[PDB]
Amino acid sequence: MVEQMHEDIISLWDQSLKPCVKLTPLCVTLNCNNVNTNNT
Amino acid sequence: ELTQPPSVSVSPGQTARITCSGAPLTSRFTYWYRQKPGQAPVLIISRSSQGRFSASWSGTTVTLTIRGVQADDEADYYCQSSDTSDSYKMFGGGTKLT
Numbered sequence: 001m002v003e004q005m006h007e008d009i010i011s012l013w014d015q016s017l018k019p020c021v022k023l024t025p026l027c028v029t030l031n032c033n034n035v036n037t038n039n040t
Numbered sequence: 041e042l043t044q045p046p047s048v049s050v051s052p053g054q055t056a057r058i059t060c061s062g063a064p065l066t067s068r069f070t071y072w073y074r075q076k077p078g079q080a081p082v083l084i085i086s087r088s089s090q091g092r093f094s095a096s097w098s099g100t101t102v103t104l105t106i107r108g109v110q111a112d113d114e115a116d117y118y119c120q121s122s123d124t125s126d127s128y129k130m131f132g133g134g135t136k137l138t
Contacts, residue, residue: 037089037090037097038066038097040090
């Protein structure tokens with residue numbers, strides 16, 4: 001029964017968010033600094 | 041211990057400038073305070089970001105400006121900055137303004 005619960009959740013996790021926004025072209029070049037204050 | 045400025049004169053109701061150099065600076069901010077001749081020291085800094093006189097959080101000297109006030113302000117000034125392990129605050133050879 002344990003193995004049944006394992007496969008049901010993951011398959012549902014892949015199904016969920018399938019009809020949602022793909023972030024495939026979002027990943028690009030990234031240039032930064034840290035905060036306005038030096039770590040306080 | 042600390043690189044405190046010895047003595048700097050006042051501008052005639054104009055720009056005011058002080059330094060105070062050290063290794064922490066970017067670690068535990070600045071904190072000034074003034075020693076009145078023969079009287080108890082009083083508040084200068086108004087630190088809150090994690091009155092009147094302000095400064096820029098720099099890693100070279102930090103500095104401090106007391107506006108265009110010629111008279112009403114003459115005392116011995118200092119600086120208290122905590123080490124990364126809360127060891128000491130370190131102070132120089134005083135700051136006697138004129």
